[PDB]
Design a protein around this ligand. Structure first.
Ligand SMILES: Cc1ccc(C(=O)O)c(Nc2c(C)cccc2S(C)(=O)=O)c1
Ligand SMILES: O=P(O)(O)OC[C@H]1O[C@H](OP(=O)(O)OP(=O)(O)O)[C@H](O)[C@@H]1O
Ligand SMILES: O=P(O)(O)OC[C@H]1O[C@H](OP(=O)(O)OP(=O)(O)O)[C@H](O)[C@@H]1O
Ligand SMILES: [Mg+2]
Ligand SMILES: [Mg+2]
Ligand SMILES: [Mg+2]
Ligand SMILES: [Mg+2]
Lengths: 340, 342
């Protein structure tokens, strides 16, 4: 195996052989790959049109180098709530959804990161709320048990990935690496709500989760958002029993009104943090509807471990988690945990 | 203009706008591009399938940064003989040998060259072994061409700013659009030449660049895989003339050449390849001679195109053969070596 071999096969518009993608990623995750080599592989992989197997191999190598949590500290039915990002458009729907879902009794372990293209990101907003994001495996495990939620800071759990992260910021363009985020949660939850900004690559991610036999809903808003949108219909690749099925989704059937895309606008960590306190404070509006919708999506995924009645219960549990104030309190206990 | 803009448009598989490829190359040449950005741009440009316009812009930027030769020192009918390389076949240095023969036939040759990348010995390496001084500067290369009839432009001496792209090319290994630039960026800027291309899908692109320059060039690719006019089989020739390109297929059998085996054209290190040159110029008959005479003749046909197809090849094959048989080629090499030590 070598760089000329692998890179040459891609430029010829051919799919890689089994195991070649793994080799390339291991060279990167061990510091035996110069930036030039990293960039060439990332671009070539993207333009060739990657397969589920190829992307699956990349994520597998990252997890094998990642810091794991202590044995038997992660529940069997833990869920993730995270997106690829890079939609170009907003408030932190995934982070807000995560708090609600956790408060509803579903164990959540988020694997997030700072912003890359947006004015603010998930981890950035959590830091602005006083949450300690840079905790080690032992403490993340304690947090999950004592609070009901844990946050895995990618740079701390994937320290060997820093070389690849540097190259990404230099080339600046979206690549296959932009898909690896949701696919490399070090806690390894078996369920989650996974957003994808790239419509022509969502089916691929769904394939990767299908191989792991996970219960996941890969979602893409017809308006382009990497979330379950309320401004129009959405596409959903439901993953269950290792089987993917493509379906169109419309929340208007449940009773959600249509919203404009500007009504879901956001800003910096300070402004987005305020949007979190507002929604968790019980404020109604288009932002709330987006959070409840996504939170329900994560609960439907959790249940996958009927279709319509699952959404009804999901929407019901999500709303109640907010209105009782359980979501607001859970956040407070999350902060106090870090200070102790 | 920015890297995200350019790289984004290429990954979406769209052709660039005017000046974008040019902006990209200038950033690389001025040392303002990160190695990762250089690699991303090279690979993206290749997989999209580049156009004659785009490849043309890159070569234009390189030539603008290159060291020029003095004014009115290069004949208007000077020719080049050089290939992309990277054919993956370790052969004797046919372009270099052919270049000497063409020069000896009375056609001024100014050769763009460099050391080997994948092979054991490149043109520059072999010339060094023969005692030829390749490290000459602009003023001295012009003298050589005038006094000897041939001059050698060593790429890194004339293209010092290309060094950033050079280091990246070696780190990634895979061939890209950058592999096409060498034959396209001869600093003497000859209006004719025989250009070898190892990549069949890109040969038509190189011909488009020369056509835009209104040059008389034969872009050649052996159907066996060589970046030369081969003797083992037919060869695909993109005939560039009058701003137009015409794809043709050349068959040496039509001119009484014998089919050879590729192993007969094999080479080795610098010391070995140097000896191979002395053999052919010495008048040794065989498959290597036939290859050199054909490529030499090809360059003469391109030269005549600056002003009939079959009749031109006939005349071309006469002058190439005669250039060796009279010993002019052997004499020109020796005088070339003496010039360096003087
Ligand atoms: C100054 C210069 C200009 C051009 C080239 C080239 O490869 O064409 C070049 N390559 C090169 C050379 C000759 C020697 C050593 C290292 C390199 S590198 C690390 O740059 O590839 C150096
Ligand atoms: O456009 P970007 O610059 O790439 O930002 C998108 C953010 O969303 C992703 O995580 P996550 O979905 O969990 O954050 P979210 O709450 O905003 O959705 C990603 O980690 C980014 O932080
Ligand atoms: O190492 P490679 O990448 O495989 O290329 C072999 C040689 O051919 C090219 O020039 P040129 O055609 O002028 O030299 P030549 O006489 O051998 O043909 C290149 O500059 C190398 O010197
Ligand atoms: Mg998200
Ligand atoms: Mg999003
Ligand atoms: Mg050659
Ligand atoms: Mg060659």
């Amino acid at each position: 195996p070598s760089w000329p071999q692998i890179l040459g096969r891609l430029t010829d518009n051919r799919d890689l052989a089994r195991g070649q993608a793994a080799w390339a990623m291991d060279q990167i995750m061990t510091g035996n790959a110069r930036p030039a080599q990293i960039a060439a592989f990332a671009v070539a992989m993207t333009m060739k049109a990657p397969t589920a197997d190829e992307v699956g191999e990349l994520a597998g190598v990252m997890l094998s180098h990642a810091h794991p949590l202590p044995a038997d500290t992660v529940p069997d039915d833990a869920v993730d709530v995270v997106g690829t990002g890079g939609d170009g458009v907003t408030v932190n729907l995934s982070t807000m959804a995560a708090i609600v879902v956790a408060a509803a009794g579903v164990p959540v372990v988020k694997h997030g990161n700072r912003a890359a293209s947006s004015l603010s990101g998930g981890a950035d907003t959590l830091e602005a709320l006083g949450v300690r994001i840079d905790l080690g495996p032992d403490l993340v495990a304690r947090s999950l048990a004592e609070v009901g939620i844990g946050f895995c800071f990618a740079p701390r759990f994937h320290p060997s990935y820093r070389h690849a992260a540097a190259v990404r910021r230099e080339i600046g363009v979206p690549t296959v690496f932009n898909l690896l985020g949701p696919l490399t949660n070090p806690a390894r939850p078996r369920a989650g709500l996974i957003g994808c900004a790239f419509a022509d690559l969502a089916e691929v991610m769904a394939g990767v989760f299908a191989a792991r036999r996970s219960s996941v809903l890969v979602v893409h808003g017809d308006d382009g958002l990497d979330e379950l949108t309320t401004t129009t219909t959405s596409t959903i690749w439901r993953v269950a029993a290792g089987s993917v099925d493509k379906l169109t989704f419309d929340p208007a059937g449940f009773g959600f009104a249509r919203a404009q895309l500007d009504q879901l606008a956001g800003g910096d960590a300070q402004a987005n943090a305020a949007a979190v306190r507002a929604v968790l404070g019980g404020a109604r509006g288009p932002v709330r509807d987006a959070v409840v919708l996504n939170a329900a999506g994560a609960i439907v995924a959790h249940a996958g471990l009927e279709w319509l009645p699952a959404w009804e219960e999901g929407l019901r549990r999500a709303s109640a988690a907010i209105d009782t104030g359980a979501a607001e309190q859970l956040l407070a206990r999350w902060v106090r945990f870090g200070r102790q």
